[PDB]
Design a protein around this ligand. Structure first.
Ligand SMILES: C[C@@H]1O[C@H](OP(=O)(O)OP(=O)(O)OC[C@H]2O[C@@H](n3cnc4c(=O)[nH]c(N)nc43)[C@H](O)[C@@H]2O)[C@@H](O)[C@H](O)[C@@H]1O
Ligand SMILES: C[C@@H]1O[C@H](OP(=O)(O)OP(=O)(O)OC[C@H]2O[C@@H](n3cnc4c(=O)[nH]c(N)nc43)[C@H](O)[C@@H]2O)[C@@H](O)[C@H](O)[C@@H]1O
Ligand SMILES: C[C@@H]1O[C@H](OP(=O)(O)OP(=O)(O)OC[C@H]2O[C@@H](n3cnc4c(=O)[nH]c(N)nc43)[C@H](O)[C@@H]2O)[C@@H](O)[C@H](O)[C@@H]1O
Ligand SMILES: C[C@@H]1O[C@H](OP(=O)(O)OP(=O)(O)OC[C@H]2O[C@@H](n3cnc4c(=O)[nH]c(N)nc43)[C@H](O)[C@@H]2O)[C@@H](O)[C@H](O)[C@@H]1O
Ligand SMILES: [Mn+2]
Ligand SMILES: [Mn+2]
Ligand SMILES: [Mn+2]
Ligand SMILES: [Mn+2]
Lengths: 371, 371, 371, 371
């Protein structure tokens, strides 16, 4: 059977990134779902049509076409505008059309090898006994698989409480049954670190030297949405969380895929599935960012992430598939919002988990409508 | 059958208010459930024991006894301390002990007649054809039943959008079947107005001249918790909402009973029940308050109340009893939080309804545990 | 003896208000300085030219002409756009051109009599023995000069702490030397009350029945900028204060003329000058406003006004003219910002008085440049 | 020639740090001024008396003695409690008593050599031709004088915009006249980096390998208050800035010595004086800190520091001594607060520079009172 792959990219650029992204996608026959926004210029639509007649199966639904679909599914207020949260439209469209693989990318992640789509098809491998990687502290640093200067770094969304003692953790590999459903490809150039790390050492990923790994049950690593393949069964749990909720009056941002990466990861391991890190590797000539503005956006989420990850360890989930498990996860987040203690847990911070949980069940309700 | 009545009062005073509250409660054999807090002095416990040996069936469970009960019901974080929200403990205790009538009062509401408890027993009257009062605009002003100087006023929690045109509304009385389950007694001296009205005209309620009324379906009026009797069947919907959630960064307060008054009211009319206003009347020598501080607390809730009340009109509910209806109301509030539009509906304002809905279902879950 | 009058109005309307404002100004030969903004449509410029051809000495400098003037005076950042603070440009222009009387008005205040300009010329009367009105509590309610329904009201900016006991205050009139330099004309229709009063009673001013008064030293009343004449000597202290400073994170608005009215009033009394209230009376068909939004804007300033007014009584001022006295007042506000105590005096609230003081001295610095 | 040295430390510890701090201070006959706070336990007072009997000239004035002193100098509200800002009391006391050298330290900075006081006496050296260090980019990284693992770091308060291109900057040493008035000793163990750096790489200072340098005019480096000697002439410009002012609603902290270090540095260079970095080196077993809480406190100041430093380059100062120059700097900060542009410059951020400027002049006013 032929594996179908759909690449999802939301962007506000002029479409010039298609010149380097299309070749690997066009040669493999994969579909590219470009999600524009209201603040997206008309040059993107002209760039999609130019690459469409070059052989690329690219679609670029206008904001009017996106809103009509979301209104038919009784979720007109779920996905906001002027935000990269609109990539959920691409997730939904690729899921309705029955694609096997959904590859989430940004407009500044460019494949480096011809087998980019083939490597991401590993999420359709199925269960089989394979070498699995476990860590004594329950955390794995995927940036250790890369050659990074000037010093060692951690990925964005990695819990800070476990960073100092992670160097003494024991990494072991064992032959165990595993079912890879999420494949987080690595990145060269500017690695996916938080604004804290980028402001401190300005890391530069030189090469991919560690190969690929599959994480065992209990070993976690943050998964982003800039070079990540998700099997269609696991896609219901890959909802990009809506940002903007204030923490002590400071609205959070840039962590929509940090939560989605951990949410689909804890849902996968509950269902006997695993997350893979490594190939395919992409180039990340990162778009220009105000690093102090990125820091101001991420800190509200960083202040809560360690506590959320700690409570998720002690909260067992229920469900037979990803829809039931993700909805069970949403109820667990509401229980965590009331038991967690900390100086950063103001009433607006606790209410952030409650509104997020409602939006998660609103996302699953839309998927159950098309199904 | 003898009707059982339990009066619930949470306070941080020294207990001197018992000298005028006990006579009407003691002569009727009603129980008084005083709910202290961590910021409550020991003089209250000595005042309860002094009145207990005078004939009053008064109980004053310590914060250790309250927390033990709430922990046994799997709700240790539901009711916060240093807040008048602890009156929910009195609601829960009176409901577990099987009291027919639950009368919510404050420590500055003093009965004026000997039949205070007997008048509040009207919530056990049952269904019968009685004169019911309807208004063309769907709103009733209970302060019009009082002689107020220097001008006409509206009760606290009355929607502001309907105040200017309420004078032209048509009030009609018709003989219809009604089942009174909530009785909001009126107040003399300082009436229950919002800080806007109290700062503007400083109203003084002189006498109760309008008698008593029972409101028909579609006619609403805010119900407070300072002189209100609730039948035990309707008590599950009388949960005092938790305050402190910020609206555009400003934490709301003083509207815990505004929401509970409207919530139990919309739940009652869905179940074919009605709300009564009038006797018994109490004196309100209001405690000393910083009126500008009261205003700063109420404004965050005032900015949202009109929109919430508008959407509740167009949202039909489900349920066979008050537990099912209140839980259905909690889900309706979450749908309203995403459809409502307005300048005051910041992400923290929308998340206020989501966390409140979770706390409402957490309150119903505790009632289902003892049941 | 040849008195010149310039009227200052800043607006974002289409200029239709000129149809009822021009006749009284055109017959008296007074100049109208209309200050447009960036959010002002082009119809206002066409309305000014249409009325200019009818005989009205009206000027309407574009935002480019305003910014060039403010840049030549080394104050390019003093006056913001998208704000009614731009009336300070009109204050500055009328002062540079040597006008004797500067009448501050809004686009919804319309004269009711033909002698509108002549009555406002009372600020050029000079010192003389005249009936002077004093109050035992130090406050005068100018709304008592009007017939107001449905109840008695207080003007916007009146201290709330002195309202309840003001009815017991003794009002006496004596023949004393006085020099009227500020004349606050009254308003029919919608009186100038705060949002607290307008939301509570919705006042309607029927007629001007109390005549005119001149307040003694030690008797204060807030002076707005919608129908107020200021002598050119007192104009340097009439700087419309810049709004937007947060108080506990809540930005203040609608009180720029409340401070300017009190500031020019305490400066005038220090120099032996007085404030007049009464004629000329204008009609105020108030523009449409979101009253709950007006409340949310005014509360931050209302929380601090009573304390600021109390300290201005204890603080003696220095200076020989309005420029020196206004600067001395600016330093006094900085001393008050550190000695005042209260729950509403967060660090941002105290810093509001410091930035306001610098902007006051920046306004006087620009006036010293043209002089 | 008979040089007096007073060490200033404010602390809430139990006084155990005196065991390792007294020997170097006691052998040199220097005075130790310990400034307790309201949240300081009584064990500190017992530790000071225990070390006083051992020969250490240590004083520990109670909060009542501090407040009496600050009240006599007409500055009772300048220095808040429950804050390390109370070291300004120690700065004031050491200045009133005529000490030549004022060494600012914290309770976790411990001398490593016997000549600790003698090395800090370099601020009494006077003008002479000496090796002076200049940098092409105008910045010097004093952490480059240390052996730091695992990677190169920048000191706390170093501008982030100049960090990437600083490696390409040219460092030259020339024989020029210089007058050292501030000597910033270095620190082993935990270096003085911001929370961004400490969270990212967790630096560890191994040894002092770069020697000592004296910076030229136009070469800046942040100066902290944990191991810094200031000549008594330069002490008036060393006022520890008061924290707590919100930036976009987020109160700043931990940067009181970042401003004081830059302020005393720009004042010294205007007067022909210089700043020295190097010996004496102290050990810094840093007190336990919540690093994410340190980050949440520092970000508000980090968002504004690069812009403030850029404008201080363009702003010329006036004055003959440090008092006149510091006051001239205070007025310069007010001009900068209105001309600076950026996303982080909300009204509360601009007003922070205005209230800080008034507090700077309030500090100089108290110094002019004792003089
Ligand atoms: C931002 C976070 O870090 C990393 O990206 P990081 O290089 O920082 O961020 P960028 O790669 O610059 O931006 C991520 C994507 O968001 C798109 N985008 C930006 N603004 C908008 C907008 O207003 N609307 C829409 N529809 N799209 C928008 C942008 O074109 C790009 O495809 C990644 O791991 C993830 O993007 C993650 O969420
Ligand atoms: C406040 C609102 O307006 C009206 O009251 P309004 O006279 O303003 O307010 P009060 O009658 O002064 O206070 C209401 C009740 O709250 C209690 N209370 C106050 N502070 C605390 C505290 O920290 N803990 C606890 N456990 N109790 C507290 C107080 O003793 C009294 O019984 C009424 O309609 C309702 O109380 C409504 O919620
Ligand atoms: C507003 C306060 O209450 C009372 O007025 P109140 O009827 O509420 O307010 P209005 O009369 O509706 O508005 C006051 C004036 O502000 C102008 N204005 C409104 N928005 C803008 C804007 O963005 N830019 C500029 N340049 N002008 C603006 C408006 O056209 C009118 O001339 C009075 O006492 C005083 O105006 C006082 O300041
Ligand atoms: C804190 C900043 O970073 C670096 O220190 P950093 O190790 O972080 O901070 P610490 O050395 O832990 O604390 C600095 C000093 O503040 C004192 N302190 C802490 N809390 C209080 C309090 O509530 N009141 C008073 N009076 N003192 C207090 C503490 O005992 C110690 O002497 C240095 O460069 C500077 O201290 C700088 O200001
Ligand atoms: Mn990117
Ligand atoms: Mn009360
Ligand atoms: Mn108006
Ligand atoms: Mn330290």
């Amino acid at each position: 059977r032929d594996i179908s792959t759909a690449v999802v990219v939301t962007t506000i650029s002029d479409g010039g990134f298609l010149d380097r992204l299309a070749p690997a996608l066009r040669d493999a026959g994969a579909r590219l779902i470009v999600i524009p926004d209201r603040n997206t210029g008309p040059a993107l639509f002209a760039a999609c049509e130019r690459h469409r007649r070059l052989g690329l199966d690219v679609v670029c639904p206008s904001v009017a076409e996106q809103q009509d679909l979301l209104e038919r599914l009784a979720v007109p207020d779920l996905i906001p505008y002027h935000s990269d949260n609109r990539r959920n439209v691409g997730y939904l469209m690729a899921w309705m059309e029955g694609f096997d693989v959904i590859v989430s990318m940004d407009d500044d992640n460019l494949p480096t090898t011809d087998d980019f789509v083939e490597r991401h098809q590993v999420v359709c491998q199925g269960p089989r006994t394979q070498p699995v990687t476990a860590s004594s502290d329950g955390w794995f640093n995927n940036c250790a698989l890369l050659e990074v200067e000037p010093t060692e770094v951690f990925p964005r969304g990695f819990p800070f409480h476990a960073r100092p003692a992670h160097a003494q953790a024991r990494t072991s590999v064992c032959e165990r049954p595993a079912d890879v459903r999420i494949n987080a490809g690595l990145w060269l150039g500017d690695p996916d670190v938080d604004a804290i790390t980028r402001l401190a050492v300005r890391p530069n990923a030189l090469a991919h030297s560690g190969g690929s790994v599959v994480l065992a049950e209990g070993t976690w690593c943050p998964v982003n949405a800039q070079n990540t393949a998700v099997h269609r069964d696991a896609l219901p749990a890959y909802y990009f969380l809506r940002m903007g909720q204030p923490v002590d009056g400071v609205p959070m941002e840039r962590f929509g895929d940090i939560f989605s990466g951990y949410f689909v990861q804890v849902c996968a391991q509950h269902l006997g599935h695993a997350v893979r890190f490594g190939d395919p590797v992409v180039e990340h000539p990162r778009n220009e960012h105000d690093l102090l503005d990125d820091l101001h956006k991420e800190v509200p989420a960083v202040r809560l992430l360690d506590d959320i990850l700690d409570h998720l360890r002690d909260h067992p989930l229920e469900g037979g598939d990803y829809l039931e498990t993700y909805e069970s996860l949403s109820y667990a987040l509401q229980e965590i919002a009331e038991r967690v203690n900390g100086r950063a847990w103001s009433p607006d911070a606790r209410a952030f988990l409650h509104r997020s949980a409602h939006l998660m069940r609103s996302w699953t309700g839309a998927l159950r409508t098309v199904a």
